[PDB]
Amino acid sequence: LEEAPWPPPEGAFVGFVLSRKEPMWADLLALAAARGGRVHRAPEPYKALRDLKEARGLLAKDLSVLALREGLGLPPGDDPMLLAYLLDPSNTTPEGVARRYGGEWTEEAGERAALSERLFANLWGRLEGEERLLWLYREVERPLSAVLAHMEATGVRLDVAYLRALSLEVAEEIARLEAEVFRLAGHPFNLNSRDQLERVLFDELGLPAIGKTEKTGKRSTSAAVLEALREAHPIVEKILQYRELTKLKSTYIDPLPDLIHPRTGRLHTRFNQTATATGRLSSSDPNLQNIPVRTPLGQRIRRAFIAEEGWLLVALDYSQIELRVLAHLSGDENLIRVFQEGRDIHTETASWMFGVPREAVDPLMRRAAKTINFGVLYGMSAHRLSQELAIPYEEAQAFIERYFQSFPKVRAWIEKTLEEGRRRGYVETLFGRRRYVPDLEARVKSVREAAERMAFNMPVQGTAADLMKLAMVKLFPRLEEMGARMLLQVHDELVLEAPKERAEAVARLAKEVMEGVYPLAVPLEVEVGIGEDWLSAKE
DNA sequence: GACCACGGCGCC
DNA sequence: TGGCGCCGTGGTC
Ligand SMILES: Nc1ncnc2c1c(C#CCCCNC(=O)CCCCCCCCCO)cn2[C@H]1C[C@H](O)[C@@H](COP(=O)(O)OP(=O)(O)OP(=O)(O)O)O1
Ligand SMILES: [Mg+2]
Ligand SMILES: [Mg+2]
Ligand SMILES: [Mg+2]
Ligand SMILES: [Mg+2]
Ligand SMILES: [Mg+2]
Numbered sequence: 001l002e003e004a005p006w007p008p009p010e011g012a013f014v015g016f017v018l019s020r021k022e023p024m025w026a027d028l029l030a031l032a033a034a035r036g037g038r039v040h041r042a043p044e045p046y047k048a049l050r051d052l053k054e055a056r057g058l059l060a061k062d063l064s065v066l067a068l069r070e071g072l073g074l075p076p077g078d079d080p081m082l083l084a085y086l087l088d089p090s091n092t093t094p095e096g097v098a099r100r101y102g103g104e105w106t107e108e109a110g111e112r113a114a115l116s117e118r119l120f121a122n123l124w125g126r127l128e129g130e131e132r133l134l135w136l137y138r139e140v141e142r143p144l145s146a147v148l149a150h151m152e153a154t155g156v157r158l159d160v161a162y163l164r165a166l167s168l169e170v171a172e173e174i175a176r177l178e179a180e181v182f183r184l185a186g187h188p189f190n191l192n193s194r195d196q197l198e199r200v201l202f203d204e205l206g207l208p209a210i211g212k213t214e215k216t217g218k219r220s221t222s223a224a225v226l227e228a229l230r231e232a233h234p235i236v237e238k239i240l241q242y243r244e245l246t247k248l249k250s251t252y253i254d255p256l257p258d259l260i261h262p263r264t265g266r267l268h269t270r271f272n273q274t275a276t277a278t279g280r281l282s283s284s285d286p287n288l289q290n291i292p293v294r295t296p297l298g299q300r301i302r303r304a305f306i307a308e309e310g311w312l313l314v315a316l317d318y319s320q321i322e323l324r325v326l327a328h329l330s331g332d333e334n335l336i337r338v339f340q341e342g343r344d345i346h347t348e349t350a351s352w353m354f355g356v357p358r359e360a361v362d363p364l365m366r367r368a369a370k371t372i373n374f375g376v377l378y379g380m381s382a383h384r385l386s387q388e389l390a391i392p393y394e395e396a397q398a399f400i401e402r403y404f405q406s407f408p409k410v411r412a413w414i415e416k417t418l419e420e421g422r423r424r425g426y427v428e429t430l431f432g433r434r435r436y437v438p439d440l441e442a443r444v445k446s447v448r449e450a451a452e453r454m455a456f457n458m459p460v461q462g463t464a465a466d467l468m469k470l471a472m473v474k475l476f477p478r479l480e481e482m483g484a485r486m487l488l489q490v491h492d493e494l495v496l497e498a499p500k501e502r503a504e505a506v507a508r509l510a511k512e513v514m515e516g517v518y519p520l521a522v523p524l525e526v527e528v529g530i531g532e533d534w535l536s537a538k539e
Numbered sequence: 540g541a542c543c544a545c546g547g548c549g550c551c
Numbered sequence: 552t553g554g555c556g557c558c559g560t561g562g563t564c
Pocket of ligand 2: 025258259
C-alpha cells in the first residue's frame with residue numbers, strides 16, 4: 001500500500017494494537033488506517049483517535065470501548081469478524097478468520113488496517129446472495145456491537161468492602177471444613193487436588209468409585225459422584241461443603257474486588273460477540289454471566305452487585321424462553337396452546353418432581369425443574385433421569401414418553417432438523433443463523449449422538465439468542481433517551497441501571513420492548529424487577 | 540511468568 | 552441434555 005500521512009479520509013478501515021486483550025485496561029500502542037490503496041500510520045495513537053468518525057475493521061468494538069473509556073464517542077462500524085462469524089460460528093478469532101479469508105493477523109497496526117480492508121471486501125463478497133445472513137448483519141450483529149461497546153465501557157458498581165469482609169468470614173469456615181476432612185482422612189493432603197482426593201476416597205478409605213473422568217479415565221470425584229456417597233461416609237458431606245465455599249471464594253469473592261477500574265470505580269466485563277457456536281454472547285475478563293445465585297452464599301455474592309447512588313437496577317428475564325421458541329419452530333398445536341393459556345411447564349414439572357401443589361413450588365424447586373425439562377428435551381437418557389430424580393427406570397421412561405406424546409410435532413421437528421443437518425451439513429435458527437455440525441454422520445454412536453444433540457439444540461438456543469440480541473438493539477436507543485444504562489446481559493436476562501425517578505418508567509418500557517421485539521406463534525412474557533442490588537432486583 | 544490440558548463447577 | 556469461562560492442579564516451557 002502507498003504510505004500517506006495521518007489522518008485518513010472518512011470510512012477508512014482501522015488497525016490497532018493493544019498492550020493487553022481487555023480494551024478497558026489496554027494501552028493503545030499503535031493506530032492506523034487503510035483506504036483507496038493508501039495506508040495511514042498515526043504518529044501518536046491517542047491523539048489520532050479523535051480524527052476517526054467510526055471504528056471500522058477487525059475487532060471494531062474493542063477500539064470503540066477504549067475510545068469511550070477516553071471520553072470519545074467513537075461507534076464501531078463494519079467488522080469482518082462479524083461477517084465471518086455469520087458464515088460460520090467456528091470463525092471466532094482474528095487469526096483464524098484472516099488465514100481463512102485472505103491474510104495474516106500480525107502485530108502491526110498498519111498491516112491490521114490493510115488486513116481489515118481486504119477481509120471485508122472478500123467476506124462481503126461471500127455474503128452476496130445470502131440475504132438472511134445479510135439481514136442478521138445489518139439488523140442484529142453490526143448495531144449490537146455498538147450497544148455492547150457502551151455496556152463494556154459503562155461497567156457495574158460492586159460493593160468491594162462487603163466482599164473483602166465476606167472473604168475473611170468464608171476463610172474461617174473453609175478452615176473448619178478442611179480440618180475435619182484431614183481428620184477423617186487420618187492425614188492432611190492437598191484438598192484442592194482431585195488426584196490426591198481420589199486416592200484418599202477410593203484407595204485409602206473404603207468408598208467405591210461410581211464413575212470415570214471423560215478424558216483421562218480416572219475415578220471421578222465430581223459432585224454427582226459425591227452426592228450418591230453422602231450417606232456412605234461423613235467426609236463426603238464436608239468435601240462437598242468445602243468445594244462450594246472454595247469455588248465461590250476463589251472465583252468470585254477474592255478476585256472481583258481487585259478488578260475495579262481506577263477511573264470509573266466500576267467493574268468492567270467483556271461481551272464477546274463471536275465466541276459461541278449457537279449465536280449466544282459470552283462474557284469474560286471477568287465472566288459476569290456466571291455470578292452465583294443458587295446457594296445462600298452465592299446469593300450474598302450476587303447482592304454485592306449494586307446500583308450507583310441515586311440509581312436503581314432493573315432486571316428483566318424472559319419466561320421459559322426456549323420452550324416458547326420450541327413451540328414456534330415445531331409449530332406444535334398443543335405446546336402453542338399451553339402458552340396461549342398462560343401455563344408454566346417449569347412449575348408443573350416441579351410439582352410433579354417433589355409431589356407438591358403448585359403453590360408449594362419455590363424458586364429453588366423451579367430451578368431443579370429446568371434441568372429436567374431442558375435435559376429431557378435435549379436428549380437426556382432415561383437412565384440419567386432415573387438417577388437425577390432417584391426414581392425407578394420405568395417411571396423415568398414414563399416421563400420421557402409422556403413428554404413427547406403431548407407434543408407430537410416436537411419429535412417430528414427434531415427429526416426434520418437432523419436430516420436437513422446431515423444433508424446440508426448445517427442447521428439454522430429462525431432467522432437463518434447457521435451452525436455446521438459435520439459429526440452427524442459419524443461412525444461411533446456416542447460421537448454421532450452427541451453431535452445430534454448439539455445439532456437440534458442450536459436452532460432453539462440460537463433463536464432465543466437472536467431474539468435477545470434484537471431486543472437489545474431496539475432497547476438501547478430508548479434507554480439513552482431516558483438517561484438509563486444497559487449494564488449486563490445473561491443470555492435471556494438484561495440488567496439495566498436507571499435514575500430512581502425514571503426507574504419505574506424504564507422497567508415498563510424495557511418489558512414492552514422485549515415482549516414485542518419479534519412476535520412468535522406464542523406470546524413472549526418478561527418478568528421485571530427493580531432494586532438496589534442484582535438479587536433484590538429479581539425478588 | 541507463560542501456555543496447555545484437565546477435572547470440576549459457576550451461570551443461562 | 553445443550554451453551555459458555557475460570558478456578559487450581561499438574562506438567563511443561
Ligand atoms: N440445564 C440447562 N440445560 C439446557 N438449557 C438450559 C439449562 C438452563 C438452566 C438452568 C438452571 C438454572 C436456571 N436459572 C434459575 O433457575 C434461576 C432463576 C432465578 C431468577 C428468575 C428470574 C425470573 C423471576 C420471575 O419471578 C437454562 N437453559 C436455557 C433454556 C432457557 O430457556 C434459557 C434461559 O433459562 P432461564 O431464564 O434460567 O429459564 P427459563 O427462561 O426457561 O424460565 P424462566 O425461569 O421463566 O426464565 O437457557
Ligand atoms: Mg487490574
Ligand atoms: Mg428466563
Ligand atoms: Mg434467565
Ligand atoms: Mg403486549
Ligand atoms: Mg474444559
